[PDB]
Design a protein around this nucleic acid. Sequence first.
DNA 1: CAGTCCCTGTTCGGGCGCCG
DNA 2: TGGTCGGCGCCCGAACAGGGACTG
Lengths: 411, 556
Amino acid sequence: PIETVPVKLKPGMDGPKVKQWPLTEEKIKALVEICTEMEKEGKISKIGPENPYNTPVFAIKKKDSTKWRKLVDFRELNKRTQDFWEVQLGIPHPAGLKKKKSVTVLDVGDAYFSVPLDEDFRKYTAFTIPSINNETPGIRYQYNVLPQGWKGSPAIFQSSMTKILEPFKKQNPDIVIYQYMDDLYVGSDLEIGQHRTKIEELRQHLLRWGLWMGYELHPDKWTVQPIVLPEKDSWTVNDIQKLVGKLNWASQIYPGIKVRQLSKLLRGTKALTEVIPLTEEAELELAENREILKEPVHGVYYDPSKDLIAEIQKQGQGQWTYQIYQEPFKNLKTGKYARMRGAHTNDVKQLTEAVQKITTESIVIWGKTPKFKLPIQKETWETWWTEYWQATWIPEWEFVNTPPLVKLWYQ
Amino acid sequence: MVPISPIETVPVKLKPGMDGPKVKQWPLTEEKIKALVEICTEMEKEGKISKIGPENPYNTPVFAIKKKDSTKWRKLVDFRELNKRTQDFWEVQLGIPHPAGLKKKKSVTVLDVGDAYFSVPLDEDFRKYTAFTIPSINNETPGIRYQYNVLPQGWKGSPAIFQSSMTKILEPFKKQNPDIVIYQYMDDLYVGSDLEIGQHRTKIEELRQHLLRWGLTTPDKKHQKEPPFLWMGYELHPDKWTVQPIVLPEKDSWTVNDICKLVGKLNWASQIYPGIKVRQLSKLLRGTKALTEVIPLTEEAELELAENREILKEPVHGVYYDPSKDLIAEIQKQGQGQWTYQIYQEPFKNLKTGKYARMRGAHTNDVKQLTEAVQKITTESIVIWGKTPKFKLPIQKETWETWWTEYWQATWIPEWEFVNTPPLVKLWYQLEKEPIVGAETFYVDGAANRETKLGKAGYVTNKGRQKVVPLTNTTNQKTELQAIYLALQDSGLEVNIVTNSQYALGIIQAQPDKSESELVNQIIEQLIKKEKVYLAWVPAHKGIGGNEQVDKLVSA
DNA sequence: CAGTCCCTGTTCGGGCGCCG
DNA sequence: TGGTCGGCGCCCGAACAGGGACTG
Ligand SMILES: Nc1ncnc2c1ncn2[C@H]1C[C@H](O)[C@@H](COP(=O)(O)OP(=O)(O)OP(=O)(O)O)O1
Ligand SMILES: OC[C@H]1O[C@@](CO)(O[C@H]2O[C@H](CO)[C@@H](O)[C@H](O)[C@H]2O)[C@@H](O)[C@@H]1O
Ligand SMILES: [Mg+2]
Ligand SMILES: [Mg+2]
């Protein structure tokens, strides 16, 4: 008996129509059990084929959880609601969250089930549950409450959320709380033990309003990956050719790069393995270059209107490099990931872990998720990615195939 | 209250701001008319159909065709214009059941609902739009106008509404009988239990009573008490299954439409019959105009077709699924980008077979294609069994390790072991990571004139070797490849090659063994003969070394 | 600095097979 | 006679996307 906030799609945009993909027997069993209870509790109810909208559903296990979590791929719906959760009921981003020594993330998604959902909107939350070997047709549902993973859920519940938060916030003014979809980011500068304790306090505070979370981030530890030039006692013609190509590409980012004196070293028509002594002019040109690469790019600043883009490169030996930007060659961050889960045995698990970590950093730093340019074949990613996914949100991605002429990002 | 209501209906709006169909009936031949008039008059007595006064301003064509393998006739309405204006549904049929999915059952019953579409009420408000006018032996007698009271055949909402309605009725029975397996596909029901045969039939009749309560009638004629059952085009036996026999046309002269049937039959056959190959038969269909046109069979499509028929000669069968035992998929390379696979649990007792022939990319190799086949098998298995089979693959463990670790794309194969069945899948050549000491260095380049299509490809080397070759009807890309081909032709067994072509370097670094382009194939041929190749890239127009010199030569 | 042309890869609708 | 609906599969060709290199 709570008022239902009306919702509408962006003008001229119909609802999502996205086929359900095949599910493993364990996931189908988990979903059937989860949906049976949710139907009993009135969160969802069965629907007919007259509803023409569908969204994909599957189940995940969060890190170390061992307990299945229902997950709906609302990316298509969220794109058609976009104006709602940005233009109107959205949330501001605490620029100070990235600065806190410790940040814990809590899944408050369950809270959203309390509030009900606009009756006119429920037609768009439809999802079909598949059956093994197509024994049965698809069992369709729709949401009667605020669904997890929809972008209207945290916005509609923001009024309710702040009141629940407000006693805690006054008690600790310094602590910073940010809400992104199903997640609550809690950033303190306290020592480890005090921090964990304050999270329990905010846990109880959530409990008496009608959920345990153990995912800890330390955004101050986070560093970047500078473009680096090799140090060599002696240089072959091949080494200088590689260096000139890397520096020339880098000059699209740092305009102060100069290759003239290094080019002079390769004037002839020379065998690649011939050793070339460096001249003083090249040593100094190389020195000045290494200094420039330590510096920042001029006039790189985040723009709230523009979308974030993430690019990833597979460097081999369990190493991955990524760049986050909005404009080409204006990079807001660049990083490297090594020795992740599945290192040296599974590229897809590692790429999946990389996408998650990068999305998390973007949420903390800018309160957005980037669109990923993934170095993988579309069919390889779609076959396996859900198997390794442990997050409650899902970024946008596209697939790219760039052979690497030069290793600019890695060494 | 002239018409009774039997089961819960489904609201069905029209597309907004649009109105019901009007279009005149077909000039139906009187012979068909005899069959139609008898059945249609019968419908009104049941309440399936109702007469309408001209207050109903809607007309939609009508026709009929005989039920296959029966004397009965099928009553079908060309609702193409009504579909266009009817609201969209979400189809609930997500795929086709496969017999290899089925577990062994002691007692199996297959039963068919009768007049299944005609037993499900159409939406009350929507009933008006059905209207059609019946025809007579002459054009003198007008014929009655009729509106459906139930789901009709030829509409676009009929299958989904029936399947959803059927599932709702079944759901209470399956909750009371958790240990009965009911495969529900349209109106065909497969019922299997480990109950002893007498007890199983008790449930079967009890299920028939449950369906009877909602007006669903299962005739004895389609009841299947005794094996082998006929289900979804398969023959089901207590311990095995097979496809119902497939007849392949014998024609001495083949048209285009002929090959399509043939191909499509062989694809249906390849789910159990191992080693079916359609590559050369499909080669005949590429870039043809008329479906009617006659085409002669090459000696490749003919040889293929010969052994394809002979594979079908011997009967084969699949077994059923044992959740206790592992799933195993084995793949063989069949040549010309053709792959077949077998999925089994006990050795030599196959659950099903299949083929992956898709040519993907202009340049590729066997390792990529094997990875594609693994993915297709994995997704297919998850549909049928909900798990990924263990893989037996004709590729050495070290070959795979070399490919995936070095490739720039994320790639992966699930748990698998090596099977030493030739032909083995391997990488034909390997590019060096570092420049080769004492090997001649070829600086290569090529250019071409966009207007004339004329160009040059050439090289310069540290030893002083040089070449420039004129080319006709080419492109910049093609000359950059040509330059590399020249360096490979004119070099010893070990060679360093420096190019500024990103296009060429990308093709060659992916280690392709096959290409659509003959020029790339010739480059491959040479790469295989070398002992060591180092390819390196430099940026053009930077005044680098040999690259500047060869650039001047080819630009001229 | 636009505007092409190459070249590649994706998508989508057509035909057939199969099931109601 | 030629003619309907939904699902899945294959193989095709055409239409479209987009990334580099080069032309003014
Ligand atoms: N060629 C078709 N065109 C349109 N719909 C069809 C066609 N064939 C089958 N269907 C649909 C409508 C049917 O109600 C349903 C089942 O078909 P089917 O079981 O073979 O016959 P039927 O149930 O209508 O009568 P019966 O069971 O007495 O043979 O599937
Ligand atoms: O991976 C592409 C594949 O995913 C689908 C559905 O899972 O689309 C989803 O992913 C896209 C790319 O991120 C989103 O743009 C889209 O909104 C989302 O549904 C399929 O549509 C597509 O084939
Ligand atoms: Mg029937
Ligand atoms: Mg040139």
